[PDB]
Homo-oligomer: A and B are copies of this chain.
Amino acid sequence: MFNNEPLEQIDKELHDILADEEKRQRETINLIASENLTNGAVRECLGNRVSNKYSEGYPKKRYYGGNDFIDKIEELCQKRALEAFNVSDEEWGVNVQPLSGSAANVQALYALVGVKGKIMGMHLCSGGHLTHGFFDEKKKVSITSDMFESKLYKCNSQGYVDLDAVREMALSFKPKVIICGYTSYPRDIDYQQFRQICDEVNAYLFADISHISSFVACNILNNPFLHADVVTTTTHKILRGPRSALIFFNKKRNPGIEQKINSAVFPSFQGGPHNNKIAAVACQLKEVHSPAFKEYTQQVLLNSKALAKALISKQIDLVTNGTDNHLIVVDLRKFSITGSKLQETCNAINVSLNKNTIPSDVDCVSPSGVRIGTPAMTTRGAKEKDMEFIADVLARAIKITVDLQEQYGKKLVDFKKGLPGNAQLQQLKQEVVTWAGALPFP
């Protein structure tokens, strides 16, 4: 007593939007530092009937039976996760149930500190995530600033983590968790110096490595597993999996952490796991461990180095004057254009990128940069020689954005009136589509 007509037939309205959405992905230069493109195999998992099963709890400790094949999938995922990230299953534990990155973080934090607990993280404006304790004078924007007591540390004037400030803050504030690993930080992290600061106050070291996960896995960047009590990561950015998250915990350093974290995920915060996710995550973690994927990840860094370098060659400034990873933050103060303006301009030419704060910005209103990254385009097969084109496109967009502002005024509502019909944008948008359309596409 069900309708099994295909999606196109059942709901032609929804299907057109989706076939359009797909075309737009295929014809966009996607420089979102947090985005990627999943392969068919990962998408086959997400469409799998395993999502029908209710499997509350953990394997061999479930509330219901019927979970024999669900148990194998969940154990396979945790196993493959520990292997991919170079950790001993005797020393490290992994929970594969969090629905997404923010959930993963709020859960792991609650586990470690509980309600009212003291946490420290990087300010949003300096490259931290919302779930690292973000609040504002007006309101406690994140649950992590409300269900926890949070203090926030900034980067210095040059866009670097200021460890002297982290210590100064940690000694006066005396928290139970110090968060590191960030959303738009273009350099590697000194976990060693974090681990030393946490020891000095007796706080846990929490590394959120969502943006750099593949680099940690593949040993291209520093390893937070040598120093952290907990490591969280999303599976959908550079790692190239489905939308899900993983919480890692150091059993050896902290006996009794395993139960705290598992009980935080369930039944404190979640109900039933999403097994289609878990399956999809397993599929990708097998690909993550191949040397073929390390090839891909090295290329993300190569493309990102070239991009930074080609952008500097065109007198465009980058925060910290370069990058150690997949992402670049472009400082736009020399052109007198805000980030939103250049985002609008780039959207108008099928260039996907986001506005982003820089060190100088007081508030998060009117950010003076944009953030770009290479995972997506590197997945689409772009190489080091292709970054000059991207850099050229961004230079032309910056110029155009400057032209339009002088004509139409500073106000965004005024600025955008200049956008539709612009012959140079139509020309440029056209140039983008011809190049992007051609690239391979999973």
A interface residue numbers (CB < 8 A to B): 1-7, 10-11, 13-14, 17-18, 20-22, 24-25, 28, 30, 32, 34-41, 43-54, 63-66, 68-70, 72-73, 76, 99-103, 106, 110, 114-115, 129-131, 134, 141-143, 146-147, 236, 240, 242-243, 267-272, 274, 276, 279, 282-283, 286-287, 292, 295-296, 299, 343-344, 346-347, 352, 354-355, 378-381, 440, 442
A142→B268 contact, CB < 8 A: yes
Residues of chain B lying within 8 A (CB to CB) of residue A21: 49-50, 53, 69-70, 73
A35-B53, A44-B7, A47-B46 given as contacts; is B143 within 8 A of A101 (CB)?
Answer: no
B17→A72 contact, CB < 8 A: yes
In addition to A7-B40, A47-B47, A141-B268, 7 A-B residue pairs with Cβ atoms within 8 Å of each other are A1-B295, A11-B286, A30-B66, A37-B49, A99-B99, A99-B100, A142-B267
Residues of chain B lying within 8 A (CB to CB) of residue A32: 54, 64, 66
B11→A130 contact, CB < 8 A: no
B50→A18 contact, CB < 8 A: yes
Residues of chain B lying within 8 A (CB to CB) of residue A242: 51
CA distance A382 to B243 in the complex (A): 36
A100→B11 contact, CB < 8 A: no
A274→B3 contact, CB < 8 A: no
B76→A39 contact, CB < 8 A: no
Residues of chain B lying within 8 A (CB to CB) of residue A347: 64-66
Residues of chain B lying within 8 A (CB to CB) of residue A1: 295-296, 299, 378-381, 440
A428 to chain B, nearest CB (A): 15
Provide 13 A-B residue pairs closer than 8 Å at the C-beta atoms, listed in order of the A residue.
A1-B299, A2-B379, A3-B39, A4-B41, A11-B283, A18-B279, A24-B69, A25-B52, A38-B49, A66-B352, A100-B274, A101-B272, A130-B267
A106→B269 contact, CB < 8 A: yes
A21-B53, A41-B5, A65-B343 given as contacts; is B10 within 8 A of A283 (CB)?
Answer: yes
CA distance A235 to B147 in the complex (A): 28
Name the CB-closest residue of B to A345.
Answer: B65
CA distance A4 to B299 in the complex (A): 18
A1-B299, A41-B6, A287-B3 given as contacts; is B354 within 8 A of A64 (CB)?
Answer: yes
A14→B343 contact, CB < 8 A: no
Residues of chain B lying within 8 A (CB to CB) of residue A43: 47-49, 51
Pick the contact of A52: B11, B37, B283, B295 (CB < 8 A): B37
CA distance A272 to B20 in the complex (A): 21
A48 to chain B, nearest CB (A): 6
Residues of chain B lying within 8 A (CB to CB) of residue A36: 52
A265 to chain B, nearest CB (A): 11
A143→B268 contact, CB < 8 A: yes
A141 to chain B, nearest CB (A): 6
